[PDB]
Amino acid sequence: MTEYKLVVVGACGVGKSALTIQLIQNHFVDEYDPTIEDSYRKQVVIDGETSLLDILDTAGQEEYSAMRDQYMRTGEGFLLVFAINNTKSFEDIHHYREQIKRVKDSEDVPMVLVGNKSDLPSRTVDTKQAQDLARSYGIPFIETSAKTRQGVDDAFYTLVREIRKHKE
Amino acid sequence: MTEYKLVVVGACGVGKSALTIQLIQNHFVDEYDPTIEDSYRKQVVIDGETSLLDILDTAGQEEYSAMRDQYMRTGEGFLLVFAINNTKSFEDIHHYREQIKRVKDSEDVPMVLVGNKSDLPSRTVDTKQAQDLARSYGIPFIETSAKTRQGVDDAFYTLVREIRKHKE
Ligand SMILES: Nc1nc2c(ncn2[C@@H]2O[C@H](COP(=O)(O)OP(=O)(O)O)[C@@H](O)[C@H]2O)c(=O)[nH]1
Ligand SMILES: Nc1nc2c(ncn2[C@@H]2O[C@H](COP(=O)(O)OP(=O)(O)O)[C@@H](O)[C@H]2O)c(=O)[nH]1
Ligand SMILES: *SCCCC(=O)NC1CCN(C(=O)COc2ccc(Cl)cc2Cl)CC1
Ligand SMILES: *SCCCC(=O)NC1CCN(C(=O)COc2ccc(Cl)cc2Cl)CC1
Ligand SMILES: [Ca+2]
Ligand SMILES: [Ca+2]
Ligand SMILES: [Ca+2]
Ligand SMILES: [Ca+2]
């Protein structure tokens, strides 16, 4: 069976760990140590086909990192997470995408844009702005809430779909 | 001296001809026949260096065209023109960029986004939308008016600068 390496990226505090732990362990973590950077395994069936996912939840500092570059080289798809109430996190998505392009020397890398914290009653990033960003990049967009679990499986499943398409 | 093939693209009526004729002949045309497709020569000096420009003002139909693909293959830089009072023209920029990517096998070819008819207050496309689009594409954005000549030289000169960079 196919095995894929997924990487969850995004600004500090946007919900990378919360999304990943919801997927893997089916609970919401409200105080997950911000420096824990680890990989989690999950076997999934998506569109009738099984895949083993190795999901790296990233947690480095704002600095150039050779190790991060290695994670980018090994990663096959990237979840680009921002929080819908944090404009900086949305602006910085661009920079994170450029990092991936630099390391992988490619603009066709599998990626999905994820607007997390959709359960919140206020937002500073409008949905249309996010949809237009994703359209400009040629990638899917999905809104999630790690807190209510809304869209969590679909975000990761969509990324797998993007990886499969690329590998074909 | 170096010679570059430039291509001016954009939806019907956005001001491709008016922009091109302002650059070449220094006057504003009101009713230029919409099917005239032609190339114009212009020697320019940009940042102290001279270049010979061969500028194609496009005027085909909405259809796949083998001849258009040949113009894209030989084109070295593209002006992506929309009109700020024509939302369709702005939406369709994306499609026109994808056509160039198709033909050029996804090359990162020089392009500049041009928001024309900037003198008009009947705007339907927000400047911030256009800035963000250009940012996502990694290209400059220039506001122009072929009517007042605002930005006209600078749009074409910026495209030349992008070509010179690409060829380095
Ligand atoms: N309301 C809301 N809060 C969330 C959501 N996801 C994460 N959080 C909160 O944001 C904080 C940071 O989440 P975390 O996953 O640790 O961020 P990371 O630095 O991106 O890994 C968490 O403690 C939660 O308080 C969500 O979908 N909704
Ligand atoms: N007000 C204004 N009108 C313009 C501008 N550029 C073009 N036009 C007018 O828009 C119409 C279409 O221009 P044209 O250059 O023929 O468009 P093309 O089909 O893209 O070649 C004509 O009536 C032009 O005079 C501009 O910057 N401002
Ligand atoms: S939470 C405490 C502060 C630390 C912080 O701000 N870290 C940031 C998080 C975002 N970041 C990225 O580089 C995101 O993009 C990444 C990360 C990891 C990989 Cl493998 C690929 C990309 Cl594109 C910088 C540090
Ligand atoms: S006023 C014109 C009447 C008909 C019309 O709607 N023609 C459109 C204009 C836009 N178009 C494109 O394909 C634009 O993109 C182009 C054109 C030419 C080249 Cl070489 C490259 C690109 Cl990306 C369809 C026809
Ligand atoms: Ca974390
Ligand atoms: Ca794509
Ligand atoms: Ca014309
Ligand atoms: Ca660029």
PDB file of N, CA, C and O in Angstrom, chain A residues 32-96:
ATOM      1  N   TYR A  32      -1.334  22.307  24.255  1.00  0.00           N
ATOM      2  CA  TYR A  32      -0.298  21.387  23.785  1.00  0.00           C
ATOM      3  C   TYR A  32       1.035  22.126  23.681  1.00  0.00           C
ATOM      4  O   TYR A  32       1.103  23.134  22.995  1.00  0.00           O
ATOM      5  N   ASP A  33       2.099  21.630  24.291  1.00  0.00           N
ATOM      6  CA  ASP A  33       3.352  22.306  24.401  1.00  0.00           C
ATOM      7  C   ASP A  33       3.782  22.786  23.018  1.00  0.00           C
ATOM      8  O   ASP A  33       3.861  21.980  22.090  1.00  0.00           O
ATOM      9  N   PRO A  34       4.038  24.109  22.868  1.00  0.00           N
ATOM     10  CA  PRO A  34       4.310  24.642  21.516  1.00  0.00           C
ATOM     11  C   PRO A  34       5.607  24.197  20.853  1.00  0.00           C
ATOM     12  O   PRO A  34       5.831  24.503  19.668  1.00  0.00           O
ATOM     13  N   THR A  35       6.482  23.513  21.585  1.00  0.00           N
ATOM     14  CA  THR A  35       7.759  23.058  21.012  1.00  0.00           C
ATOM     15  C   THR A  35       7.762  21.590  20.614  1.00  0.00           C
ATOM     16  O   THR A  35       8.767  21.044  20.181  1.00  0.00           O
ATOM     17  N   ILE A  36       6.675  20.883  20.914  1.00  0.00           N
ATOM     18  CA  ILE A  36       6.653  19.462  20.516  1.00  0.00           C
ATOM     19  C   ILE A  36       6.482  19.347  19.018  1.00  0.00           C
ATOM     20  O   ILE A  36       5.500  19.795  18.454  1.00  0.00           O
ATOM     21  N   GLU A  37       7.479  18.748  18.414  1.00  0.00           N
ATOM     22  CA  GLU A  37       7.513  18.558  16.968  1.00  0.00           C
ATOM     23  C   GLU A  37       7.642  17.097  16.830  1.00  0.00           C
ATOM     24  O   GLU A  37       8.601  16.509  17.324  1.00  0.00           O
ATOM     25  N   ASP A  38       6.612  16.464  16.307  1.00  0.00           N
ATOM     26  CA  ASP A  38       6.636  15.026  16.168  1.00  0.00           C
ATOM     27  C   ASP A  38       5.812  14.560  14.986  1.00  0.00           C
ATOM     28  O   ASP A  38       4.994  15.320  14.435  1.00  0.00           O
ATOM     29  N   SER A  39       6.050  13.302  14.633  1.00  0.00           N
ATOM     30  CA  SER A  39       5.326  12.624  13.574  1.00  0.00           C
ATOM     31  C   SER A  39       4.351  11.604  14.149  1.00  0.00           C
ATOM     32  O   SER A  39       4.684  10.921  15.171  1.00  0.00           O
ATOM     33  N   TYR A  40       3.196  11.471  13.526  1.00  0.00           N
ATOM     34  CA  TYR A  40       2.117  10.635  14.051  1.00  0.00           C
ATOM     35  C   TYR A  40       1.687   9.808  12.845  1.00  0.00           C
ATOM     36  O   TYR A  40       1.571  10.276  11.676  1.00  0.00           O
ATOM     37  N   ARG A  41       1.363   8.549  13.079  1.00  0.00           N
ATOM     38  CA  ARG A  41       0.966   7.635  12.081  1.00  0.00           C
ATOM     39  C   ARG A  41      -0.551   7.502  12.081  1.00  0.00           C
ATOM     40  O   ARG A  41      -1.178   7.434  13.188  1.00  0.00           O
ATOM     41  N   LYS A  42      -1.118   7.381  10.890  1.00  0.00           N
ATOM     42  CA  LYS A  42      -2.525   6.974  10.785  1.00  0.00           C
ATOM     43  C   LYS A  42      -2.756   6.264   9.430  1.00  0.00           C
ATOM     44  O   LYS A  42      -2.452   6.800   8.356  1.00  0.00           O
ATOM     45  N   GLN A  43      -3.373   5.100   9.495  1.00  0.00           N
ATOM     46  CA  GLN A  43      -3.858   4.377   8.322  1.00  0.00           C
ATOM     47  C   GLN A  43      -5.257   4.883   8.020  1.00  0.00           C
ATOM     48  O   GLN A  43      -6.067   4.908   8.940  1.00  0.00           O
ATOM     49  N   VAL A  44      -5.531   5.223   6.770  1.00  0.00           N
ATOM     50  CA  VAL A  44      -6.810   5.817   6.341  1.00  0.00           C
ATOM     51  C   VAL A  44      -7.316   5.175   5.090  1.00  0.00           C
ATOM     52  O   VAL A  44      -6.535   4.633   4.346  1.00  0.00           O
ATOM     53  N   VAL A  45      -8.620   5.208   4.868  1.00  0.00           N
ATOM     54  CA  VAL A  45      -9.169   4.868   3.576  1.00  0.00           C
ATOM     55  C   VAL A  45      -9.804   6.119   3.046  1.00  0.00           C
ATOM     56  O   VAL A  45     -10.588   6.756   3.716  1.00  0.00           O
ATOM     57  N   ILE A  46      -9.436   6.462   1.818  1.00  0.00           N
ATOM     58  CA  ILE A  46      -9.901   7.713   1.155  1.00  0.00           C
ATOM     59  C   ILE A  46     -10.309   7.358  -0.256  1.00  0.00           C
ATOM     60  O   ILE A  46      -9.524   6.770  -0.977  1.00  0.00           O
ATOM     61  N   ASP A  47     -11.557   7.636  -0.624  1.00  0.00           N
ATOM     62  CA  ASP A  47     -12.053   7.308  -1.968  1.00  0.00           C
ATOM     63  C   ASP A  47     -11.829   5.830  -2.285  1.00  0.00           C
ATOM     64  O   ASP A  47     -11.552   5.438  -3.395  1.00  0.00           O
ATOM     65  N   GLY A  48     -11.978   4.980  -1.260  1.00  0.00           N
ATOM     66  CA  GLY A  48     -11.961   3.539  -1.428  1.00  0.00           C
ATOM     67  C   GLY A  48     -10.571   2.943  -1.433  1.00  0.00           C
ATOM     68  O   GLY A  48     -10.466   1.737  -1.579  1.00  0.00           O
ATOM     69  N   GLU A  49      -9.522   3.724  -1.248  1.00  0.00           N
ATOM     70  CA  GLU A  49      -8.159   3.260  -1.346  1.00  0.00           C
ATOM     71  C   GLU A  49      -7.428   3.585  -0.067  1.00  0.00           C
ATOM     72  O   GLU A  49      -7.520   4.688   0.484  1.00  0.00           O
ATOM     73  N   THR A  50      -6.712   2.605   0.448  1.00  0.00           N
ATOM     74  CA  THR A  50      -6.046   2.800   1.729  1.00  0.00           C
ATOM     75  C   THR A  50      -4.690   3.449   1.517  1.00  0.00           C
ATOM     76  O   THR A  50      -4.040   3.263   0.508  1.00  0.00           O
ATOM     77  N   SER A  51      -4.302   4.248   2.496  1.00  0.00           N
ATOM     78  CA  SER A  51      -2.965   4.845   2.546  1.00  0.00           C
ATOM     79  C   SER A  51      -2.515   4.944   3.983  1.00  0.00           C
ATOM     80  O   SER A  51      -3.313   5.290   4.878  1.00  0.00           O
ATOM     81  N   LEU A  52      -1.215   4.752   4.173  1.00  0.00           N
ATOM     82  CA  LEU A  52      -0.592   4.973   5.487  1.00  0.00           C
ATOM     83  C   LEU A  52       0.001   6.340   5.495  1.00  0.00           C
ATOM     84  O   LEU A  52       0.786   6.683   4.601  1.00  0.00           O
ATOM     85  N   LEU A  53      -0.477   7.191   6.393  1.00  0.00           N
ATOM     86  CA  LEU A  53      -0.005   8.569   6.513  1.00  0.00           C
ATOM     87  C   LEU A  53       0.972   8.717   7.658  1.00  0.00           C
ATOM     88  O   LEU A  53       0.815   8.171   8.740  1.00  0.00           O
ATOM     89  N   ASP A  54       2.073   9.432   7.418  1.00  0.00           N
ATOM     90  CA  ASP A  54       3.045   9.807   8.425  1.00  0.00           C
ATOM     91  C   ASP A  54       2.988  11.320   8.442  1.00  0.00           C
ATOM     92  O   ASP A  54       3.355  11.957   7.433  1.00  0.00           O
ATOM     93  N   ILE A  55       2.422  11.877   9.501  1.00  0.00           N
ATOM     94  CA  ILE A  55       2.093  13.277   9.614  1.00  0.00           C
ATOM     95  C   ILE A  55       3.000  13.994  10.595  1.00  0.00           C
ATOM     96  O   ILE A  55       3.030  13.713  11.800  1.00  0.00           O
ATOM     97  N   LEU A  56       3.784  14.934  10.074  1.00  0.00           N
ATOM     98  CA  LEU A  56       4.738  15.719  10.845  1.00  0.00           C
ATOM     99  C   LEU A  56       4.070  17.020  11.262  1.00  0.00           C
ATOM    100  O   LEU A  56       3.666  17.830  10.393  1.00  0.00           O
ATOM    101  N   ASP A  57       3.916  17.229  12.557  1.00  0.00           N
ATOM    102  CA  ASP A  57       3.376  18.439  13.157  1.00  0.00           C
ATOM    103  C   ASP A  57       4.595  19.296  13.527  1.00  0.00           C
ATOM    104  O   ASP A  57       5.370  18.961  14.422  1.00  0.00           O
ATOM    105  N   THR A  58       4.814  20.395  12.778  1.00  0.00           N
ATOM    106  CA  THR A  58       6.074  21.174  12.894  1.00  0.00           C
ATOM    107  C   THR A  58       6.017  22.161  14.024  1.00  0.00           C
ATOM    108  O   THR A  58       4.945  22.707  14.354  1.00  0.00           O
ATOM    109  N   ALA A  59       7.196  22.457  14.613  1.00  0.00           N
ATOM    110  CA  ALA A  59       7.292  23.304  15.802  1.00  0.00           C
ATOM    111  C   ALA A  59       8.662  23.924  16.003  1.00  0.00           C
ATOM    112  O   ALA A  59       9.204  23.911  17.109  1.00  0.00           O
ATOM    113  N   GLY A  60       9.176  24.573  15.005  1.00  0.00           N
ATOM    114  CA  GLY A  60      10.481  25.233  15.092  1.00  0.00           C
ATOM    115  C   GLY A  60      10.383  26.721  15.390  1.00  0.00           C
ATOM    116  O   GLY A  60       9.327  27.271  15.640  1.00  0.00           O
ATOM    117  N   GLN A  61      11.530  27.378  15.410  1.00  0.00           N
ATOM    118  CA  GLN A  61      11.633  28.820  15.621  1.00  0.00           C
ATOM    119  C   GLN A  61      11.677  29.544  14.283  1.00  0.00           C
ATOM    120  O   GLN A  61      11.974  28.954  13.238  1.00  0.00           O
ATOM    121  N   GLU A  62      11.494  30.864  14.354  1.00  0.00           N
ATOM    122  CA  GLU A  62      11.592  31.731  13.164  1.00  0.00           C
ATOM    123  C   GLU A  62      13.060  31.965  12.875  1.00  0.00           C
ATOM    124  O   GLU A  62      13.717  32.810  13.492  1.00  0.00           O
ATOM    125  N   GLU A  63      13.601  31.116  12.042  1.00  0.00           N
ATOM    126  CA  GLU A  63      14.998  31.106  11.670  1.00  0.00           C
ATOM    127  C   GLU A  63      15.169  30.167  10.487  1.00  0.00           C
ATOM    128  O   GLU A  63      14.415  29.235  10.297  1.00  0.00           O
ATOM    129  N   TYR A  64      16.225  30.362   9.730  1.00  0.00           N
ATOM    130  CA  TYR A  64      16.594  29.380   8.736  1.00  0.00           C
ATOM    131  C   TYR A  64      17.060  28.136   9.424  1.00  0.00           C
ATOM    132  O   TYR A  64      17.799  28.228  10.391  1.00  0.00           O
ATOM    133  N   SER A  65      16.644  26.987   8.953  1.00  0.00           N
ATOM    134  CA  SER A  65      16.943  25.728   9.568  1.00  0.00           C
ATOM    135  C   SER A  65      17.242  24.666   8.496  1.00  0.00           C
ATOM    136  O   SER A  65      16.378  24.312   7.691  1.00  0.00           O
ATOM    137  N   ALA A  66      18.443  24.126   8.509  1.00  0.00           N
ATOM    138  CA  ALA A  66      18.767  23.002   7.635  1.00  0.00           C
ATOM    139  C   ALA A  66      17.851  21.819   7.903  1.00  0.00           C
ATOM    140  O   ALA A  66      17.507  21.086   6.968  1.00  0.00           O
ATOM    141  N   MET A  67      17.473  21.585   9.163  1.00  0.00           N
ATOM    142  CA  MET A  67      16.609  20.466   9.481  1.00  0.00           C
ATOM    143  C   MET A  67      15.237  20.671   8.908  1.00  0.00           C
ATOM    144  O   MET A  67      14.631  19.744   8.426  1.00  0.00           O
ATOM    145  N   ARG A  68      14.685  21.864   9.022  1.00  0.00           N
ATOM    146  CA  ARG A  68      13.443  22.156   8.347  1.00  0.00           C
ATOM    147  C   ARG A  68      13.513  21.915   6.841  1.00  0.00           C
ATOM    148  O   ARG A  68      12.599  21.362   6.236  1.00  0.00           O
ATOM    149  N   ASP A  69      14.627  22.340   6.229  1.00  0.00           N
ATOM    150  CA  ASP A  69      14.762  22.025   4.819  1.00  0.00           C
ATOM    151  C   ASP A  69      14.683  20.516   4.569  1.00  0.00           C
ATOM    152  O   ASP A  69      14.077  20.069   3.577  1.00  0.00           O
ATOM    153  N   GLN A  70      15.308  19.719   5.446  1.00  0.00           N
ATOM    154  CA  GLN A  70      15.205  18.291   5.288  1.00  0.00           C
ATOM    155  C   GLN A  70      13.774  17.779   5.410  1.00  0.00           C
ATOM    156  O   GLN A  70      13.367  16.928   4.657  1.00  0.00           O
ATOM    157  N   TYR A  71      13.004  18.336   6.330  1.00  0.00           N
ATOM    158  CA  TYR A  71      11.592  17.969   6.438  1.00  0.00           C
ATOM    159  C   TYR A  71      10.815  18.300   5.175  1.00  0.00           C
ATOM    160  O   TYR A  71       9.907  17.582   4.746  1.00  0.00           O
ATOM    161  N   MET A  72      11.175  19.419   4.529  1.00  0.00           N
ATOM    162  CA  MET A  72      10.537  19.810   3.314  1.00  0.00           C
ATOM    163  C   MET A  72      10.903  18.871   2.172  1.00  0.00           C
ATOM    164  O   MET A  72      10.043  18.469   1.388  1.00  0.00           O
ATOM    165  N   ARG A  73      12.169  18.444   2.120  1.00  0.00           N
ATOM    166  CA  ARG A  73      12.590  17.518   1.082  1.00  0.00           C
ATOM    167  C   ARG A  73      11.844  16.185   1.189  1.00  0.00           C
ATOM    168  O   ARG A  73      11.451  15.622   0.189  1.00  0.00           O
ATOM    169  N   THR A  74      11.623  15.717   2.408  1.00  0.00           N
ATOM    170  CA  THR A  74      11.000  14.413   2.704  1.00  0.00           C
ATOM    171  C   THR A  74       9.513  14.512   2.603  1.00  0.00           C
ATOM    172  O   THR A  74       8.867  13.525   2.274  1.00  0.00           O
ATOM    173  N   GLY A  75       8.944  15.653   2.903  1.00  0.00           N
ATOM    174  CA  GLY A  75       7.497  15.779   2.818  1.00  0.00           C
ATOM    175  C   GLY A  75       6.922  15.731   1.428  1.00  0.00           C
ATOM    176  O   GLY A  75       7.462  16.322   0.485  1.00  0.00           O
ATOM    177  N   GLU A  76       5.793  15.053   1.276  1.00  0.00           N
ATOM    178  CA  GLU A  76       5.162  14.909  -0.012  1.00  0.00           C
ATOM    179  C   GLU A  76       3.989  15.840  -0.190  1.00  0.00           C
ATOM    180  O   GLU A  76       3.552  16.042  -1.316  1.00  0.00           O
ATOM    181  N   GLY A  77       3.424  16.343   0.888  1.00  0.00           N
ATOM    182  CA  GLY A  77       2.320  17.301   0.841  1.00  0.00           C
ATOM    183  C   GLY A  77       2.279  18.143   2.078  1.00  0.00           C
ATOM    184  O   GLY A  77       2.698  17.621   3.153  1.00  0.00           O
ATOM    185  N   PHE A  78       1.766  19.348   1.990  1.00  0.00           N
ATOM    186  CA  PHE A  78       1.812  20.297   3.050  1.00  0.00           C
ATOM    187  C   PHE A  78       0.473  20.895   3.316  1.00  0.00           C
ATOM    188  O   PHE A  78      -0.205  21.324   2.353  1.00  0.00           O
ATOM    189  N   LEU A  79       0.060  20.912   4.583  1.00  0.00           N
ATOM    190  CA  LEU A  79      -1.135  21.585   4.977  1.00  0.00           C
ATOM    191  C   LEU A  79      -0.707  22.976   5.389  1.00  0.00           C
ATOM    192  O   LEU A  79       0.045  23.094   6.402  1.00  0.00           O
ATOM    193  N   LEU A  80      -1.176  23.985   4.701  1.00  0.00           N
ATOM    194  CA  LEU A  80      -0.834  25.372   4.996  1.00  0.00           C
ATOM    195  C   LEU A  80      -1.929  25.990   5.871  1.00  0.00           C
ATOM    196  O   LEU A  80      -2.964  26.364   5.384  1.00  0.00           O
ATOM    197  N   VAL A  81      -1.707  26.025   7.169  1.00  0.00           N
ATOM    198  CA  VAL A  81      -2.717  26.400   8.133  1.00  0.00           C
ATOM    199  C   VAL A  81      -2.541  27.859   8.546  1.00  0.00           C
ATOM    200  O   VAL A  81      -1.466  28.263   8.959  1.00  0.00           O
ATOM    201  N   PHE A  82      -3.662  28.549   8.529  1.00  0.00           N
ATOM    202  CA  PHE A  82      -3.729  29.889   9.161  1.00  0.00           C
ATOM    203  C   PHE A  82      -4.933  29.925  10.049  1.00  0.00           C
ATOM    204  O   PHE A  82      -5.770  28.999  10.004  1.00  0.00           O
ATOM    205  N   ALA A  83      -5.015  30.884  10.943  1.00  0.00           N
ATOM    206  CA  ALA A  83      -6.175  31.085  11.770  1.00  0.00           C
ATOM    207  C   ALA A  83      -6.990  32.230  11.269  1.00  0.00           C
ATOM    208  O   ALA A  83      -6.453  33.285  10.954  1.00  0.00           O
ATOM    209  N   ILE A  84      -8.293  32.090  11.253  1.00  0.00           N
ATOM    210  CA  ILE A  84      -9.117  33.051  10.562  1.00  0.00           C
ATOM    211  C   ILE A  84      -9.243  34.370  11.318  1.00  0.00           C
ATOM    212  O   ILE A  84      -9.722  35.374  10.738  1.00  0.00           O
ATOM    213  N   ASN A  85      -8.756  34.384  12.557  1.00  0.00           N
ATOM    214  CA  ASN A  85      -8.737  35.591  13.368  1.00  0.00           C
ATOM    215  C   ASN A  85      -7.310  36.128  13.553  1.00  0.00           C
ATOM    216  O   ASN A  85      -7.082  36.905  14.474  1.00  0.00           O
ATOM    217  N   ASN A  86      -6.374  35.734  12.677  1.00  0.00           N
ATOM    218  CA  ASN A  86      -4.969  36.170  12.798  1.00  0.00           C
ATOM    219  C   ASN A  86      -4.476  36.542  11.391  1.00  0.00           C
ATOM    220  O   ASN A  86      -4.047  35.714  10.624  1.00  0.00           O
ATOM    221  N   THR A  87      -4.557  37.828  11.065  1.00  0.00           N
ATOM    222  CA  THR A  87      -4.176  38.262   9.703  1.00  0.00           C
ATOM    223  C   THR A  87      -2.721  37.976   9.405  1.00  0.00           C
ATOM    224  O   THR A  87      -2.399  37.604   8.283  1.00  0.00           O
ATOM    225  N   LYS A  88      -1.851  38.174  10.378  1.00  0.00           N
ATOM    226  CA  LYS A  88      -0.445  37.870  10.132  1.00  0.00           C
ATOM    227  C   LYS A  88      -0.226  36.458   9.690  1.00  0.00           C
ATOM    228  O   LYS A  88       0.573  36.147   8.804  1.00  0.00           O
ATOM    229  N   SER A  89      -0.929  35.500  10.331  1.00  0.00           N
ATOM    230  CA  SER A  89      -0.786  34.097   9.966  1.00  0.00           C
ATOM    231  C   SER A  89      -1.209  33.825   8.522  1.00  0.00           C
ATOM    232  O   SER A  89      -0.673  32.976   7.892  1.00  0.00           O
ATOM    233  N   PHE A  90      -2.172  34.604   8.044  1.00  0.00           N
ATOM    234  CA  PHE A  90      -2.641  34.490   6.658  1.00  0.00           C
ATOM    235  C   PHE A  90      -1.631  35.146   5.698  1.00  0.00           C
ATOM    236  O   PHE A  90      -1.303  34.532   4.690  1.00  0.00           O
ATOM    237  N   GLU A  91      -1.127  36.299   6.039  1.00  0.00           N
ATOM    238  CA  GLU A  91      -0.068  36.904   5.240  1.00  0.00           C
ATOM    239  C   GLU A  91       1.135  36.053   5.118  1.00  0.00           C
ATOM    240  O   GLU A  91       1.728  35.877   4.030  1.00  0.00           O
ATOM    241  N   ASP A  92       1.489  35.348   6.214  1.00  0.00           N
ATOM    242  CA  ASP A  92       2.715  34.560   6.206  1.00  0.00           C
ATOM    243  C   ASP A  92       2.617  33.240   5.465  1.00  0.00           C
ATOM    244  O   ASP A  92       3.639  32.639   5.145  1.00  0.00           O
ATOM    245  N   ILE A  93       1.412  32.811   5.152  1.00  0.00           N
ATOM    246  CA  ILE A  93       1.213  31.631   4.310  1.00  0.00           C
ATOM    247  C   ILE A  93       2.038  31.727   3.034  1.00  0.00           C
ATOM    248  O   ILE A  93       2.659  30.739   2.575  1.00  0.00           O
ATOM    249  N   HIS A  94       2.084  32.919   2.455  1.00  0.00           N
ATOM    250  CA  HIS A  94       2.827  33.153   1.256  1.00  0.00           C
ATOM    251  C   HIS A  94       4.265  32.808   1.419  1.00  0.00           C
ATOM    252  O   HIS A  94       4.880  32.165   0.577  1.00  0.00           O
ATOM    253  N   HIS A  95       4.857  33.270   2.525  1.00  0.00           N
ATOM    254  CA  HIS A  95       6.263  32.993   2.835  1.00  0.00           C
ATOM    255  C   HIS A  95       6.535  31.542   3.039  1.00  0.00           C
ATOM    256  O   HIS A  95       7.543  31.012   2.563  1.00  0.00           O
ATOM    257  N   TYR A  96       5.621  30.806   3.679  1.00  0.00           N
ATOM    258  CA  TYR A  96       5.793  29.392   3.934  1.00  0.00           C
ATOM    259  C   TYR A  96       5.736  28.644   2.648  1.00  0.00           C
ATOM    260  O   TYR A  96       6.563  27.735   2.408  1.00  0.00           O
TER     261      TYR A  96
END
